[PDB]
Ligand binder design. Sequence first.
Ligand SMILES: *[C@@H]1O[C@H](CO)[C@@H](O[C@H]2O[C@H](CO)[C@@H](O[C@@H]3O[C@H](CO[C@@H]4O[C@H](CO)[C@@H](O)[C@H](O)[C@@H]4O)[C@@H](O)[C@H](O[C@@H]4O[C@H](CO)[C@@H](O)[C@H](O)[C@@H]4O)[C@@H]3O)[C@H](O)[C@H]2NC(C)=O)[C@H](O)[C@H]1NC(C)=O
Ligand SMILES: *[C@@H]1O[C@H](CO)[C@@H](O[C@@H]2O[C@H](CO)[C@@H](O[C@@H]3O[C@H](CO)[C@@H](O)[C@H](O)[C@@H]3O)[C@H](O)[C@H]2NC(C)=O)[C@H](O)[C@H]1NC(C)=O
Ligand SMILES: *[C@H]1O[C@H](CO)[C@@H](O[C@H]2O[C@H](CO)[C@@H](O)[C@H](O)[C@H]2NC(C)=O)[C@H](O)[C@H]1NC(C)=O
Ligand SMILES: *[C@H]1O[C@H](CO)[C@@H](O)[C@H](O)[C@H]1NC(C)=O
Length: 326
Amino acid sequence: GRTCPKPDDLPFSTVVPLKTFYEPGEEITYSCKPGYVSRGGMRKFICPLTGLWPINTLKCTPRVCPFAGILENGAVRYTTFEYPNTISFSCNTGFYLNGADSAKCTEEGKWSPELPVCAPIICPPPSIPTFATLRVYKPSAGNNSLYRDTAVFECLPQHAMFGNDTITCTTHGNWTKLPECREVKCPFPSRPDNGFVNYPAKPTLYYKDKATFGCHDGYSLDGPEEIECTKLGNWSAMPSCKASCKLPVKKATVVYQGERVKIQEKFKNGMLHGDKVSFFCKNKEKKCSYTEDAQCIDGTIEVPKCFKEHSSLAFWKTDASDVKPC
Ligand SMILES: *[C@@H]1O[C@H](CO)[C@@H](O[C@H]2O[C@H](CO)[C@@H](O[C@@H]3O[C@H](CO[C@@H]4O[C@H](CO)[C@@H](O)[C@H](O)[C@@H]4O)[C@@H](O)[C@H](O[C@@H]4O[C@H](CO)[C@@H](O)[C@H](O)[C@@H]4O)[C@@H]3O)[C@H](O)[C@H]2NC(C)=O)[C@H](O)[C@H]1NC(C)=O
Ligand SMILES: *[C@@H]1O[C@H](CO)[C@@H](O[C@@H]2O[C@H](CO)[C@@H](O[C@@H]3O[C@H](CO)[C@@H](O)[C@H](O)[C@@H]3O)[C@H](O)[C@H]2NC(C)=O)[C@H](O)[C@H]1NC(C)=O
Ligand SMILES: *[C@H]1O[C@H](CO)[C@@H](O[C@H]2O[C@H](CO)[C@@H](O)[C@H](O)[C@H]2NC(C)=O)[C@H](O)[C@H]1NC(C)=O
Ligand SMILES: *[C@H]1O[C@H](CO)[C@@H](O)[C@H](O)[C@H]1NC(C)=O
């Protein structure tokens, strides 16, 4: 007699019992693999006497979990909400993912784990470090603060801050490291020789306290006119009063700050400490002029040896200042 051959292998199905051949009368059963369903309902067949399995209308397709394209305030990386695909989630900035970051479409046709949700990241109101007060804070959400919000602290009078004065509301619901408010004092500043110094009239001096200096006519300051009590208990700087220099020569064109000037004119009232200048002097041989420097260093200034000061009443030898450059 005849016999039916092995059954055609249908997509996403299972046949039972699956033999390579059947006797007329035997029965087999197609079933969609788990995670699939059929536009039909599980087809069974009995091997005909002809030995030819009938036409199979069985079509199995993936069960489809519920639409999950939208994630309020977030992104949903997906392909097709059908078994056994995986879909992942994430939230826009400001929000955190309250739930699993991904989920699969189970063979049952539901999402596992249950779809997550994006939620607003928040920090509770911040604390005030000792000896400080924050003047930059206002709840953005209820009694609390939202992501990347800020609060700014300013220490208390006579107290120095250590660490940024500004804190932000991090993704961890907590704020960034807080600043410190220690109290700092500075010793009184020493008066400068040939000069004087001033500062608040009180028992002790603390952080951010100002002290000003100066010098008697003959001298000038070699440091800033004003200084303050730094957070490290010492001062901005300690200026001294340095002696000015009398004009080195009677008449001469010199370079002061890259420009030519009449030295007797520029420093009519003497040169201050530090003032630098450049003298001109020719190079006999090549008949051109070059320049060397000099500077007022506390009452003294070394005019270059190469310099030659021609007298006003002589003039008859051209000045180095007027010789072509070298
Ligand atoms: C805001 O809120 C956060 C809570 O979520 C909080 O936590 C974060 O910051 C803390 C530290 O402040 C973190 O804990 C530390 O993590 C360090 C880095 O992690 C390591 O992990 C890697 C794994 O990849 C290992 O390879 C490393 O060896 C290491 O273990 C870690 O080094 C710290 O460990 C210590 O090391 C010390 C060294 O001398 C030891 O004394 C000490 O005993 C310990 O061994 C510590 O674990 C925490 O994980 C962070 N968590 C998150 C989610 O960010 C923040 O601190 C908080 N911010 C503020 C300002 O409060
Ligand atoms: C006010 O007082 C503080 C307290 O000492 C002074 O801090 C000192 O600052 C210097 C640099 O400005 C630090 O030097 C550091 O180490 C060596 C110096 O040989 C070198 O690697 C670098 O110069 C480096 O910056 C020094 O460590 C630091 N003092 C201490 C104890 O740590 C500050 O300079 C004073 N300010 C004024 C205006 O006087
Ligand atoms: C945030 O905290 C405030 C506290 O200022 C709460 O305000 C009041 O209203 C509540 C009503 O449920 C009371 O139960 C609180 O006792 C009362 N607070 C004070 C100080 O009297 C407010 O409810 C909180 N708001 C949110 C959104 O959490
Ligand atoms: C600290 O505050 C922020 C960073 O947190 C930034 O402005 C800078 O790094 C610091 N600002 C100041 C004023 O030190």
